[PDB]
Every structure is written in C-alpha cells, then in structure tokens.
Amino acid sequence: KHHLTNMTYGKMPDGTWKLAETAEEAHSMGFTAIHLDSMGWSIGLGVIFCLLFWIVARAANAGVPTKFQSAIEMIIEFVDSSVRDTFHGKSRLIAPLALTIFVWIFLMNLMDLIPVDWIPQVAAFVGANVFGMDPHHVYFKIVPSTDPNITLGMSLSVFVLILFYSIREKGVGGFVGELALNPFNPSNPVAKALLIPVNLILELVTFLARPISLALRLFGNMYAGELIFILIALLPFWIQWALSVPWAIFHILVITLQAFIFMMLTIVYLSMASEKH
Amino acid sequence: AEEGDDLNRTYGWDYIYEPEAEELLNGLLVRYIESMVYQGVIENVACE
Amino acid sequence: MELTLGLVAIASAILIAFGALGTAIGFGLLGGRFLEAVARQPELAPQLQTRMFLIAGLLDAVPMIGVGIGLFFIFANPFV
Amino acid sequence: MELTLGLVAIASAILIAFGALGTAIGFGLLGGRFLEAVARQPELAPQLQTRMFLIAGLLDAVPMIGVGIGLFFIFANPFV
Amino acid sequence: ELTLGLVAIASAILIAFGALGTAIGFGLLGGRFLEAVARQPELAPQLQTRMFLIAGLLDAVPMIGVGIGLFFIFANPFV
Amino acid sequence: ELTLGLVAIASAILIAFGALGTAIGFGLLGGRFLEAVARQPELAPQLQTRMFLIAGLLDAVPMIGVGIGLFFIFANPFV
Amino acid sequence: MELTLGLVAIASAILIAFGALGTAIGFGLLGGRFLEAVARQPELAPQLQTRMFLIAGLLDAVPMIGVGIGLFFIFANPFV
Amino acid sequence: MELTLGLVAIASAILIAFGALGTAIGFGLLGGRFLEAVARQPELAPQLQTRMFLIAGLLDAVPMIGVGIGLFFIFANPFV
Amino acid sequence: ELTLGLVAIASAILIAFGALGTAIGFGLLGGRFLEAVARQPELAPQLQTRMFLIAGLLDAVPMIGVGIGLFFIFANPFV
Amino acid sequence: MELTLGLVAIASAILIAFGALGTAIGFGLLGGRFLEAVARQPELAPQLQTRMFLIAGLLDAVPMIGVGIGLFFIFANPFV
Amino acid sequence: ELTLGLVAIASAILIAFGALGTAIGFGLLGGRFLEAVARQPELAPQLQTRMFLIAGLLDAVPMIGVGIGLFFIFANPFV
Amino acid sequence: MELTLGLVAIASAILIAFGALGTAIGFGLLGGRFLEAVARQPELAPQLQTRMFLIAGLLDAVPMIGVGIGLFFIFANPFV
Amino acid sequence: ATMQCDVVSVKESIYSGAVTMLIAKGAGGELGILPGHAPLVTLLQPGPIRVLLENGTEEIVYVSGGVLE
Amino acid sequence: NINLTLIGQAIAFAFFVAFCMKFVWPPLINAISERQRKIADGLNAAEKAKA
Amino acid sequence: IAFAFFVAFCMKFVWPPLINAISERQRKIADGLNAAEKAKA
Structure with missing residues (x-):
C-alpha cells in the first residue's frame, strides 16, 4: 500500500515525463535536464480546442442555434461584454487574447478532475506494450496537468505580453522610470538607506512576483486537488466513498474562479500597460 | 410627485442621515403636510 | 536530521493553519459586510456578487501559496 | 524518535485548534452582521440566507483541509 | 516521558484555544442579536430561532478539539 | 520533572485562555447590552432575560477548561 | 527541580498576566460603550451604572479565579 | 539555579510588560469614546469625567496586582 | 546540520507573515469597498480603479519577503 | 554564565519592546478619536487637548516602569 | 554554524513581521481613502496627494528593519 | 561564545522589529482617521496636519529608543 | 469661503445670502460648517443657530423645531 | 484493491451526473429558450411593422 | 520555452475571432432598427 503510495509519488511532483537531456527517460532519478516533456499534452489540448472553436469561427451563425451554438453564443457574448466594459480606447486586438487564455486555462484545470489512478492504469497497457510494467509504475507515464512548469509558461507568456504592450505606446520613458513612493526621509542615515535601495525595489516589485504568484497559486490549487484525491484513496472498502464529493465540487468552483480571476487580472494588467506612466 | 426630476441631481453622493431615515422622514411628512394645509387655507382666503 | 524533518513539518x-x-x-469580513450592503441595495445583486468574487479572488492568494508550499515540503521535501 | 513524535503531534x-x-x-462576526442586516429587511430572509450559506461554504475550505491532514497524521504520520 | 507531556x-x-x-x-453573535432585538423585539421568536440555528454552525470543530483532547488524555497512539 | 512543569x-x-x-x-457583550438599554430602557427586563440566557450560553467551555485545570492540579496522569 | 519550579513560576x-x-x-470596552451610551442619554445614568456594575461584577470573576490560582501556587500548591 | 534565575527574569x-x-x-479604549462624548457634550463633560475616573481605578486593579507580584519577585522571587 | 532546517x-x-x-x-479593503460601492453603483469603475491601485500599494514587501525566502530555499547562504 | 547573559539581555x-x-x-488609539472630534468642532480644542495630555501621560506610566527596569538591568542586572 | 542559521x-x-x-x-489607509473618495469623488487629487504623503511617511522604521535584514544578508555582523 | 552571538542577534x-x-x-491608526477628517472638512487641513505631526512625533519616540538600542547592540558589543 | 445659506420658516424666508461659518446643534452634536462641506441632512434642535458672515461679524437665528441641510 | 477504488469512483461519477443534470441544466435550457423566444419576437415585430 | 510557443499560438490566430464579432454587433443593430422603425410610423 504505502509502497503503492510512494510508487505514485514517483509520478507527480517533477514533470517533463520522459525528458532526458543526455539522460534516461524512465529513471525518476535523473534530476538533471532542461527539457519539459509534459507541455505537449497541454499544447495539444489547447490546439484541439482552438480548432473546435474554429469549426464555428469559420462558420457564420445568426438564426436559431442548437444547444451547442446557443451556448457558444452566450459564452462569447459574455466574454466580449466583459472585455469591452472593463477597459476601452485600446484597439490592438487583445479581447480575443483574454478570451483564449481564459478558456484554455479553464479546460486545462477542468481536465484534471479524473481519479489519479486511471492515467497509470490505462498507461500500464502501453507499458506492457513498451517501456516496462512496474518500472513504469514508479515514474514513466505522461502526467495530466499538474506540472508548475506549464503554469510558469503561462505566467511568463503573459509577462511578455505585459512588456510588449507597455511599450505598445512607447512608454519606454515611463517603463524605465517609476513613480517612487519617496525620494528620502530625514535622519540622513535613513536618507542614504532609502535613496538607493527603496525606490528600486519598489519599481521591481510592481511587476515581478505577480505572474509568478499567479502561476504557483494555480499550481497550489491543482496540486492540492490531486493530493486530496490520493489521500482519499485510502481504504476504498469500508469508506462510504463520500470524503471527496463536497470538497471536489468546492474545488471545481475554485477552478472556475481561478480561470476567471486570472483573465480579470490580465485585463487590469493590460489596462495599466495601456495607461501611461 | 416629481416622478422625473430630482433623481438626476443626486450624483455619486448621498445626504448623510444623522438620524435614522424613519424619524427624519416622519418629521418631513409632518411638516410637508402642514405646509400644504397652510397654503390651501391661504388659497381659500383668496377665493373668499 | 529527522528532527530537521520535524522542523519542516x-x-x-x-x-x-496560519x-x-x-x-x-x-x-x-467580506461576507458580513456584503450581506449588509446587499441588504441596503437589494436590487443590483448581480454586479454586487460580481465584484464580491473579484475581491475574494484578490484576497486568498498568498495564504493558499503558503499552504501549497508547506504540503510540497511535507511530501517533496527539499533535502529530506 | 520521541522528539519527532512530539513535533508532529x-x-x-x-x-x-487554530x-x-x-x-x-x-x-x-458573520452571523452578527447577517442578523443586523436582516433586522432591517425581514422580507429578504430567503435570498439573504441563501447568500449567507453561499459564503459560509466559502469560509470552511482550508479549515477542513487542516482537519483532514491532522486526522490522517494522527492515524499515520509522514516521515516514518 | 516527553511524548506524554507533549501530547498532553x-x-x-x-x-484552551x-x-x-x-x-x-x-x-460577537450576541451583541448584534441584542441590537436586532432592540430594533425588532416582535420577531424575537424567529430571530432567536435563526440565532440558535447559526449558533449550531459555530462550535462544531471546537467540540471536536475538546473530544480529541479527551482521546489523548484517555487513550491515543504513539504513547 | 519535565512532565511536571509541562502539566503545570x-x-x-x-x-488563562x-x-x-x-x-x-x-x-463586548455587556457593552452592546448597555448600548441597547440606552436605546430602549423599557425592554430592559426582556433584555436582561436574554443577558442571563446568553451568559449561560457563553460560560460552558470556560468552566470545562476550569475543570481540566482542577483535574490536572488534584489528580491527573502523565505525572 | 529547578526546571519544574521555574516552569511553575x-x-x-x-x-x-492573562x-x-x-x-x-x-x-x-465596557468604558467606551458605557460612555457612548450615557452621553446618548445622560438622564438614565442611574440605570446605566446599575447594569454596568452588575455586568462588571459578573465579569472579572474568572480573572479572579486565575489570580486565586496564582495565589494558591505562590502560598502553597502541589507540584512544588 | 541561575537557569531558574533566567526563568524568573x-x-x-x-x-x-504585558x-x-x-x-x-x-x-x-476608554479614552476614544470619552473624548468623543465630551466633545459632543461639553456641558456634561464634568460628570462624564467623574464616571471616567470612577472606572479608571476599576481598570488597573488587577494589572496593579500583577505588577506588584512582579516587583515583589524582583525584590524576592519566592520558591528560591 | 540543523541550520538547513533553520533556513527552511x-x-x-x-x-506565513x-x-x-x-x-x-x-x-479590510474589500469590506470597505463593498460598503462604499452600494451607495453609488454608477461610480463603480472609478472606485474599482482606485482599489486596484491600493491593492498594488498593499502587497510589495510581502512579495519581497516571500521572494527572499524562496531564494534562501534554493540558493542557500548562511549555511 | 553566557547562557544567563543572554537570558538577561x-x-x-x-x-x-512590549x-x-x-x-x-x-x-x-488616542489620536484617532482626538483628530475626529477636533475636526468635528474647532472650539473645545483647549480642554480637549488638556484631557488628551492628561490621559496620555496617564497611559505610558507602567511602560515607563518597564523601561526603567530594563535600563536598571542595563546599568547592572540585580542578579548574576 | 548555529550563528548563521539564527541570524537568518x-x-x-x-x-516578514x-x-x-x-x-x-x-x-486601514486604503479603506479610509476608498470610503472618502466614495463620499466626495471630487477632492480626489489632493486626497491622493495626502495619501501618497502619509504612506511614504508610513514605512520608515519597517524600512529600517528591512535595511538591517539586508545588511545581515550581505555581511552579517556577529559572524 | 557562538551562543552569545546568536542571542545578541x-x-x-x-x-x-517590535x-x-x-x-x-x-x-x-493615525492615517485612517486623519484622512477621514481631511475628507469630511478639507478647510481644516493645515491645523489637522499640525495635530497629525504633533501626535506622530509623540508616538514614535519610544520605538526610536528601541532602534537606538538595537544600533548600540550592533556597533557596540555589550555582553560580548 | 462663502456658501449660499438660506433660513426659511414654512410661512416665508427669514435669512438668505452667502455665509462663511455655520455653528449649530444638530439632531446629534454641534457641528461647524464651511463651504465645500459634505452633503448632509440634520434635524434642528430648539434654540438659536449662529452663523459667521463675510463681514467678520456673526448672525444668530432662533429655531423651535425644523430641519437642516 | 483497484476494483474497490473503481466501484466507489463510479458511484461518485453517477451521483455527479445525476445531481448536476438535476440542479444545473434547467436554468441553462431556460436561458437558451428565452434567447430564442426574444429573437423570434423581434423578428415577428419586424414583419408586422413592415405590414 | 513556453513563452514563444504561446505568443506565436495566439498571434497568428488573433484576427479571425474579432472579425467574427462584427456580425453579432451589426445583428443587434438590426434588432434596434426594428424598434425604431416601429416607433416612426
């Protein structure tokens, strides 16, 4: 049992499933590489979803929609209303950007609602097919979305958007500078200790740990979900199998609010980027 | 009364209610009714 | 070393917890005041709840951060 | 040994407890504010109580998380 | 020795907490409930019903901690 | 030795808690109570009824802790 | 014995201290609220002080118990 | 024993300090509401101050006792 | 050996702080924010904007502390 | 000795600190309400600030005594 | 060894503290500012002037603590 | 001796810190109420700022003493 | 500065014109009023209300029941 | 072992589907129907206006 | 690695979704036109 627990734990924390920078792909102990061999699953899900959208994007629908296109219309109407009412005076085609990032993170965290054991169970047949059976049980499978590497990728992608749209209006003068909270204070030791470090750390903190916190808070929520699953998996005979259900739906609501507020924060950050400094 | 006026002039501000809305409203009702009675009496005088 | 592990725990x-x-x-605090406010203005409940969830999201980031990193050390402890 | 057991307990x-x-x-505090609000408008008891429970559910997530972690550690600690 | 006192x-x-x-x-509940009853002594039946209803929400896990303390006092693992 | 000081x-x-x-x-409760009295001295009887009600609704777990302290002082294990 | 006696201290x-x-x-808290209330209605000061002394006499009884436990220990108690 | 001396310190x-x-x-706590009341009600500010003093001595009695015990132990910490 | 645990x-x-x-x-900010917006729901965006700026004004040194703590978690001086 | 040096320091x-x-x-807490009231009425400021200084000096006395004990030990602890 | 860990x-x-x-x-500052601008959306400019002034004057001694911490981080005294 | 260095740190x-x-x-505390006052009645801003500075200087005094004691322990080395 | 302040009984007006400083005793406490003051409504208590004029002198007007805005 | 977990998980899933349909789908269908009916009413207003 | 990935993913997709929105917005205009038309008559 606890053998099985640790054998599961081999899978989750460090991702990049079967990455090997001149190393092994099924070792769970390489601990030395730079490849992210787990992003592809998230990327493929995003691509297949964006094509699922493209099916209706290449289409023009104006009459009476069925359930599919009806829901499509309410969704797109709400997202366009939100992006529009939030901010304005800005035409560089960002509303689709927010829509896309929101719905992708939506689906990405949604897909993690399955029992943890079923990914390695379905993968065990491929393991019998290729790359071993029990040395796969420790860490050889591709993992669904729990890897903070992916989250880090979204964080810095949005950060790149932030930097580029801050210089959208050539705010380079305001981008290099900042509004210092104070130039100095009396007790001239204080003045010296304030002049150099303080406003610099002020300017730095205005942007740095915000996307970092975004990504690793996603990781915290989603990792928390998976670990709750694994812990409830103890004694599935005399249990009523009702430990999860309340917390599970709560965390579902959490995921919804996650995606929503992340895209909200995207909106406010792009507003500040569209605001001169 | 005044169904289309006096709701425009209230900007993003409100009169602060040092008393509860209830008692101040009651005093307003009292005084406003008495004022109308007064004016009607004066009008009756003029008609006379 | 095992007492270092106790330190980590x-x-x-x-x-x-904290x-x-x-x-x-x-x-x-948000729940109490929100109930009071919506009682004062029972009409625009939609936007009220909208900004309410806005604030709720803005609120609990860093505490959840501490929770997550704590559990990470509980299981993926650096320098076990 | 004993030190680690005391640590985890x-x-x-x-x-x-915390x-x-x-x-x-x-x-x-939440109930106090809710009662204070509902005293003004008894008419909206149902919807107001609905939102009351809507947020009461919001409160208790990580308290229950801590309760579960502590219960399991009581049953089985990590770092045996 | 040490484990006994630590659990205790x-x-x-x-x-205590x-x-x-x-x-x-x-x-906290009492103050505002008194305020409301001062405002609405008439609904005091229903208000008091709600008061005790929400008080039922209050102290579940406090009593759980008390019972866990009793468990530790009487019989607990790792002793 | 160590367990003795720990128990004390x-x-x-x-x-203390x-x-x-x-x-x-x-x-705090008394402050809100006198506030309500300043609002309406006439409902003071019913208010006092509520006072002793909620006082009896507030002292239980404290007295439980008092009993715990007494049990520790007079005769308790882990000594 | 030094250990446990210092711990008892x-x-x-x-x-x-508690x-x-x-x-x-x-x-x-009592003083703030009392002064607020009495300033609201200076006439009813007698009843105000009435209730205030009543509730205050009901108040520090448990602090009295704690201080009395301290007195027991300082005079003479078990474990010493 | 000097370890117990640090304990007593x-x-x-x-x-x-506590x-x-x-x-x-x-x-x-007393002063905020006292000040607001006397500001709004200067004419009766005198007997307001009267009650305030009436309760000021009521306040520190237990703190006075605690400080007294502390200073007595400073002079002579019993359980020597 | 234990100073690595000290760093952790x-x-x-x-x-945590x-x-x-x-x-x-x-x-606190959310409490007061919802308090105020109900008065002038029409003036919401301005208040919202100010509130966002305040939130930014709020959190600087908390990220400073958390960043330096994680740096020490990974890059360990004072071993 | 060293341990006691650290203890007393x-x-x-x-x-x-406390x-x-x-x-x-x-x-x-004094200044909050003082500013509020003095804003409300710019007349009664003299006796207002008079009672303010009164109670402010009334407050820090025991903190000043703790300060005195600290500096007492600073010049020399009444102990080893 | 112990010295570096305790200094950290x-x-x-x-x-953090x-x-x-x-x-x-x-x-507290932002909440009060928000409520103020809620009641008077007009005096916002000089109110924010006071706001930045008072906040810039707010951090000085926690800023001192930060400076001492960083001085420890680079070249800690009592090595 | 390392013990003493850790203790003095x-x-x-x-x-x-405290x-x-x-x-x-x-x-x-001062900032919230001063902002309140200047918001309600901007005319008194000069005298309001005067009172604000008066109380601000009065407040931070003892903390400055603690800061100076920290410096005195840092540069000068008592008990070392 | 100056605020346009008007005092009026139900029958007819009593005071009108600009005023600089208003001192009354509201439904709650006494207050001081200067132009630019926040929007507020208060219940007049019986007694005289005294206000400071642009000339540097101060008017006083008695009230027995009424409301103030 | 594995099957014991699967059976409980499947029970959870069945409850998921039943309760989620029960408590969530009527509002969605209602929204869809309202959208369609308002569009149709606007259309009919158009033809009758031309008449 | 993900940064260029995602920015390139969205950029050479960024136009068609907004191009879609014109249909909806002009559609609403037709409904508005129906209301105005009913009023003039």
Whole structure:
C-alpha cells in the first residue's frame, strides 16, 4: 500500500515525463535536464480546442442555434461584454487574447478532475506494450496537468505580453522610470538607506512576483486537488466513498474562479500597460 | 410627485442621515403636510 | 536530521493553519459586510456578487501559496 | 524518535485548534452582521440566507483541509 | 516521558484555544442579536430561532478539539 | 520533572485562555447590552432575560477548561 | 527541580498576566460603550451604572479565579 | 539555579510588560469614546469625567496586582 | 546540520507573515469597498480603479519577503 | 554564565519592546478619536487637548516602569 | 554554524513581521481613502496627494528593519 | 561564545522589529482617521496636519529608543 | 469661503445670502460648517443657530423645531 | 484493491451526473429558450411593422 | 520555452475571432432598427 503510495509519488511532483537531456527517460532519478516533456499534452489540448472553436469561427451563425451554438453564443457574448466594459480606447486586438487564455486555462484545470489512478492504469497497457510494467509504475507515464512548469509558461507568456504592450505606446520613458513612493526621509542615515535601495525595489516589485504568484497559486490549487484525491484513496472498502464529493465540487468552483480571476487580472494588467506612466 | 426630476441631481453622493431615515422622514411628512394645509387655507382666503 | 524533518513539518503546519486563519478572517469580513450592503441595495445583486468574487479572488492568494508550499515540503521535501 | 513524535503531534494540534478558533469567531462576526442586516429587511430572509450559506461554504475550505491532514497524521504520520 | 507531556500540552492548547474561540463567537453573535432585538423585539421568536440555528454552525470543530483532547488524555497512539 | 512543569504550564494555559476569552467577549457583550438599554430602557427586563440566557450560553467551555485545570492540579496522569 | 519550579513560576506569570489583559481590555470596552451610551442619554445614568456594575461584577470573576490560582501556587500548591 | 534565575527574569518581563500593554489598551479604549462624548457634550463633560475616573481605578486593579507580584519577585522571587 | 532546517523554518515564517498581512489587508479593503460601492453603483469603475491601485500599494514587501525566502530555499547562504 | 547573559539581555529587550509596542498603540488609539472630534468642532480644542495630555501621560506610566527596569538591568542586572 | 542559521532566522522575522505590519497599515489607509473618495469623488487629487504623503511617511522604521535584514544578508555582523 | 552571538542577534532583531511594528500600527491608526477628517472638512487641513505631526512625533519616540538600542547592540558589543 | 445659506420658516424666508461659518446643534452634536462641506441632512434642535458672515461679524437665528441641510 | 477504488469512483461519477443534470441544466435550457423566444419576437415585430 | 510557443499560438490566430464579432454587433443593430422603425410610423 504505502509502497503503492510512494510508487505514485514517483509520478507527480517533477514533470517533463520522459525528458532526458543526455539522460534516461524512465529513471525518476535523473534530476538533471532542461527539457519539459509534459507541455505537449497541454499544447495539444489547447490546439484541439482552438480548432473546435474554429469549426464555428469559420462558420457564420445568426438564426436559431442548437444547444451547442446557443451556448457558444452566450459564452462569447459574455466574454466580449466583459472585455469591452472593463477597459476601452485600446484597439490592438487583445479581447480575443483574454478570451483564449481564459478558456484554455479553464479546460486545462477542468481536465484534471479524473481519479489519479486511471492515467497509470490505462498507461500500464502501453507499458506492457513498451517501456516496462512496474518500472513504469514508479515514474514513466505522461502526467495530466499538474506540472508548475506549464503554469510558469503561462505566467511568463503573459509577462511578455505585459512588456510588449507597455511599450505598445512607447512608454519606454515611463517603463524605465517609476513613480517612487519617496525620494528620502530625514535622519540622513535613513536618507542614504532609502535613496538607493527603496525606490528600486519598489519599481521591481510592481511587476515581478505577480505572474509568478499567479502561476504557483494555480499550481497550489491543482496540486492540492490531486493530493486530496490520493489521500482519499485510502481504504476504498469500508469508506462510504463520500470524503471527496463536497470538497471536489468546492474545488471545481475554485477552478472556475481561478480561470476567471486570472483573465480579470490580465485585463487590469493590460489596462495599466495601456495607461501611461 | 416629481416622478422625473430630482433623481438626476443626486450624483455619486448621498445626504448623510444623522438620524435614522424613519424619524427624519416622519418629521418631513409632518411638516410637508402642514405646509400644504397652510397654503390651501391661504388659497381659500383668496377665493373668499 | 529527522528532527530537521520535524522542523519542516512544523513549518508547513505553521503556514497552512496560519494562512487558513488569514482566509477565515478576510472571507468572514467580506461576507458580513456584503450581506449588509446587499441588504441596503437589494436590487443590483448581480454586479454586487460580481465584484464580491473579484475581491475574494484578490484576497486568498498568498495564504493558499503558503499552504501549497508547506504540503510540497511535507511530501517533496527539499533535502529530506 | 520521541522528539519527532512530539513535533508532529504538536503540529496537528496547531492546525486543528487554530483553524477551529478562526472558523468559530468568523461565524460569530458573520452571523452578527447577517442578523443586523436582516433586522432591517425581514422580507429578504430567503435570498439573504441563501447568500449567507453561499459564503459560509466559502469560509470552511482550508479549515477542513487542516482537519483532514491532522486526522490522517494522527492515524499515520509522514516521515516514518 | 516527553511524548506524554507533549501530547498532553497539545490537547491542552487545543481545548484552551477552542474555549477562546467559542467565547469570542458567543460575544460577537450576541451583541448584534441584542441590537436586532432592540430594533425588532416582535420577531424575537424567529430571530432567536435563526440565532440558535447559526449558533449550531459555530462550535462544531471546537467540540471536536475538546473530544480529541479527551482521546489523548484517555487513550491515543504513539504513547 | 519535565512532565511536571509541562502539566503545570498546560493547566495555566487552559485557565488563562478561558479567563481571557470570557473577559473579552463578555465585556463586548455587556457593552452592546448597555448600548441597547440606552436605546430602549423599557425592554430592559426582556433584555436582561436574554443577558442571563446568553451568559449561560457563553460560560460552558470556560468552566470545562476550569475543570481540566482542577483535574490536572488534584489528580491527573502523565505525572 | 529547578526546571519544574521555574516552569511553575512561568505558569503563575501566565495566570496573573492573562487575568490582567482580560480585566484591562474588557473594562476598556465596557468604558467606551458605557460612555457612548450615557452621553446618548445622560438622564438614565442611574440605570446605566446599575447594569454596568452588575455586568462588571459578573465579569472579572474568572480573572479572579486565575489570580486565586496564582495565589494558591505562590502560598502553597502541589507540584512544588 | 541561575537557569531558574533566567526563568524568573522571563516571567517578570512577561508580567510587567504585558500588564503595561493591557493598561495601554484599556486606557485607549476608554479614552476614544470619552473624548468623543465630551466633545459632543461639553456641558456634561464634568460628570462624564467623574464616571471616567470612577472606572479608571476599576481598570488597573488587577494589572496593579500583577505588577506588584512582579516587583515583589524582583525584590524576592519566592520558591528560591 | 540543523541550520538547513533553520533556513527552511525562516523562509516558512517569511511566507506565513506575508500571508496574513496580504489576507487581512485585503479583507479590510474589500469590506470597505463593498460598503462604499452600494451607495453609488454608477461610480463603480472609478472606485474599482482606485482599489486596484491600493491593492498594488498593499502587497510589495510581502512579495519581497516571500521572494527572499524562496531564494534562501534554493540558493542557500548562511549555511 | 553566557547562557544567563543572554537570558538577561533578552529579558531586557522584551521589557523595552512590549513597552514601546503598548505605548505606540495607546497613542494611536488616542489620536484617532482626538483628530475626529477636533475636526468635528474647532472650539473645545483647549480642554480637549488638556484631557488628551492628561490621559496620555496617564497611559505610558507602567511602560515607563518597564523601561526603567530594563535600563536598571542595563546599568547592572540585580542578579548574576 | 548555529550563528548563521539564527541570524537568518532573525532577518526573516524582521522582514516578514514588518511586512505584515505594513500590510495592515496600508489596509486601514486604503479603506479610509476608498470610503472618502466614495463620499466626495471630487477632492480626489489632493486626497491622493495626502495619501501618497502619509504612506511614504508610513514605512520608515519597517524600512529600517528591512535595511538591517539586508545588511545581515550581505555581511552579517556577529559572524 | 557562538551562543552569545546568536542571542545578541536575536535581541537586536526583537528590539528593532517590535518597535517598527508599534510605529506601523500607530501610523495606520493615525492615517485612517486623519484622512477621514481631511475628507469630511478639507478647510481644516493645515491645523489637522499640525495635530497629525504633533501626535506622530509623540508616538514614535519610544520605538526610536528601541532602534537606538538595537544600533548600540550592533556597533557596540555589550555582553560580548 | 462663502456658501449660499438660506433660513426659511414654512410661512416665508427669514435669512438668505452667502455665509462663511455655520455653528449649530444638530439632531446629534454641534457641528461647524464651511463651504465645500459634505452633503448632509440634520434635524434642528430648539434654540438659536449662529452663523459667521463675510463681514467678520456673526448672525444668530432662533429655531423651535425644523430641519437642516 | 483497484476494483474497490473503481466501484466507489463510479458511484461518485453517477451521483455527479445525476445531481448536476438535476440542479444545473434547467436554468441553462431556460436561458437558451428565452434567447430564442426574444429573437423570434423581434423578428415577428419586424414583419408586422413592415405590414 | 513556453513563452514563444504561446505568443506565436495566439498571434497568428488573433484576427479571425474579432472579425467574427462584427456580425453579432451589426445583428443587434438590426434588432434596434426594428424598434425604431416601429416607433416612426
């Protein structure tokens, strides 16, 4: 049992499933590489979803929609209303950007609602097919979305958007500078200790740990979900199998609010980027 | 009364209610009714 | 070393509980005042709840951060 | 040995007791504000109570998380 | 020796913080309920019903901590 | 030795927390009560009824902690 | 014996010190609210003081118990 | 024994400083509402101050006792 | 050996205090925010904007502490 | 010896620290309402600030005593 | 060895503890500013002037704690 | 001797941190109410700022003493 | 500065014109009023109300029941 | 072992589907129907206006 | 690695979704036109 627990734990924390920078792909102990061999699953899900959208994007629908296109219309109407009412005076085609990032993170965290054991169970047949059976049980499978590497990728992608749209209006003068909270204070030791470090750390903190916190808070929520699953998996005979259900739906609501507020924060950050400094 | 006026002039501000809305409203009702009675009496005088 | 592990367990417990208290206070204040406000203005409840969830999201980031990193050290402890 | 056992037992006590404190007092303030509000408008008791429970559910997530972690650690600690 | 005292003090701080929290919540609820009854003495039946209903929400895990302290005092693992 | 001081400290913590919570919450409650009286001295009888009600609704777990301290002081295990 | 006697001294300090905060802070709350109420209606000062002395006499009884435990220990108690 | 001397030093710091803190808290609590009342009601500010003094002595009694125990132990810490 | 555990503990404390600071400053701001907006729902966006700027004004040194703590978690001076 | 040196130095540090904390809290809570009232009516400021200084000096006394004990040990602890 | 770990602990306490205090102060400040601008959306400019002034004057001694912590981080005294 | 160095670092951290926090909490208290006052009635802003500075200087004094004691422990080395 | 302040009984007006400083005793406490003051409504208590004029002198007007805005 | 977990998980899933349909789908269908009916009413208003 | 990935993913997709929105917005205009038309008559 606890053998099985640790054998599961081999899978989750460090991702990049079967990455090997001149190393092994099924070792769970390489601990030395730079490849992210787990992003592809998230990327493929995003691509297949964006094509699922493209099916209706290449289409023009104006009459009476069925359930599919009806829901499509309410969704797109709400997202366009939100992006529009939030901010304005800005035409560089960002509303689709927010829509896309929101719905992708939506689906990405949604897909993690399955029992943890079923990914390695379905993968065990491929393991019998290729790359071993029990040395796969420790860490050889591709993992669904729990890897903070992916989250880090979204964080810095949005950060790149932030930097580029801050210089959208050539705010380079305001981008290099900042509004210092104070130039100095009396007790001239204080003045010296304030002049150099303080406003610099002020300017730095205005942007740095915000996307970092975004990504690793996603990781915290989603990792928390998976670990709750694994812990409830103890004694599935005399249990009523009702430990999860309340917390599970709560965390579902959490995921919804996650995606929503992340895209909200995207909106406010792009507003500040569209605001001169 | 005044169904289309006096709701425009209230900007993003409100009169602060040092008393509860209830008692101040009651005093307003009292005084406003008495004022109308007064004016009607004066009008009756003029008609006379 | 195992007592160092106990140190780690204590630190994680600190973070998780103590940020949980952060949430327990913030969300409670928001709930109380929100109920009072919506009582004052029972008509525009949609936008009220909208901005309410806005604030709720803005609130509990860092405490949940501490919870997550604490559990991470509980299981993926650096320098076990 | 004994030191680690005491460490984890104290950690569990921290989590559960401290979260219990927070949730208890949070309920106190929340209910006080809810009663104060509903006193103004008895007409909206149903919807107001609906939102009351809607947020009461928001409160208790990580308290229960800590309760579960402490209970399991009571049953089986990590770092055996 | 050490484990005994450590478990005992864990239970003690458990129940002490529980008493603290339940008293604080009692006061918090009480003040505003008194305020409301001062405003609405007439609905005091229904208000009091809601009062005790929400008080039922209050002190679940405090009593849980008290019971866990009793468990530690009487019989608990790792002793 | 160590267990003795641990038990004494734990009992002191229990009673100290009980006293702190009682005093603080109880004082807040009395303040709101006198506030309500200043609102309406006429409902003071019913208000006092509620007072003794909620006082009896506030003192239980503190007295439990008092009993815990007494049990520790007079005769308790882990000594 | 030095260990446990010093710990008992710490414990008595806790006893009396918590009694001190409870009395001081609770009576400060009482004073603030009392002065507010009496200024609201200076006429009913007699009944106000009536209820206030009643509730205050009901107040510090448990602080009195803690201080009395300290007195028991300082005069003579078990474990010493 | 000198370890117990450090213990007593810690306990004394506890009692005296902690009671000072409580006294400050209670003083501010009373003072805020006292000040507001006398500002709004200067004509009766006299008997307001009368009640305020009436309760000022009621406030510090337990803190006074705690400080007294601390200073007595400073002079002569019993359980020598 | 234990000073690595000391580094871990200190980083944890940095994180934990930044957590309460953020979580309770946010609580206060949200309370007052919802309080105010109900008066002038029409004036919501301006207040919202100011509130966002305040939230930014709130959280700087908490991320400073958490960043330095995580740096010490990974890059360890004072071993 | 060294251990007792640290014991007494830490105890003195605590005595000064809690005194500073409590004093700051007291002045802040005083000043809030003082500013509020003096804003309300610019007339009664003289006796207003008179009672303000009265109670402010009334407050920090025990903190000043803790400060005195700390500096007492600073010149020389009444102990080894 | 112990010295470096304890120095790290002390710097961590400094930074985190101060950051929490700065957070609570900014909480009160921003809440009051928000309510003020809610009642008078007009005097916002000079009110924010006061706001930045008072906040810039707010951090000085927690800033000192930060400076001491960083001085420890680069070249700690009492090595 | 390393014990003494750690203890003095701890004492200096205490002295600086708690005093800084006194400054922080008091400054928040003053700032909220001063902002309130200047908002309600902007005309008194000069005298309001005067009172604000008067109380600000009065408050932070003892925390400055703690800061100076920290510096005195840092550069000068008592008990070392 | 100056605020346009008007005092009026139900029958007819009593005072009108700019005023600089208003001192009354509201439904709650006494207050001081200067132009630019927040929007507020208060219940007049019986007694005289005294206000400071642009000339540097101060008017006083008695009230027995009424409301103030 | 594995099957014991699967059976409980499947029970959870069945409850998921049943309760989620029950408590969530009527509002969605209602929204869809309202959208369609308002569009149709606007259309009919168009033809009758031309008439 | 993900940064260029995602920015390139969205950029050479960024136009068609907005191009879609014109249909909806002009559609609403037709409904508005129906209301105005009913009023003039």
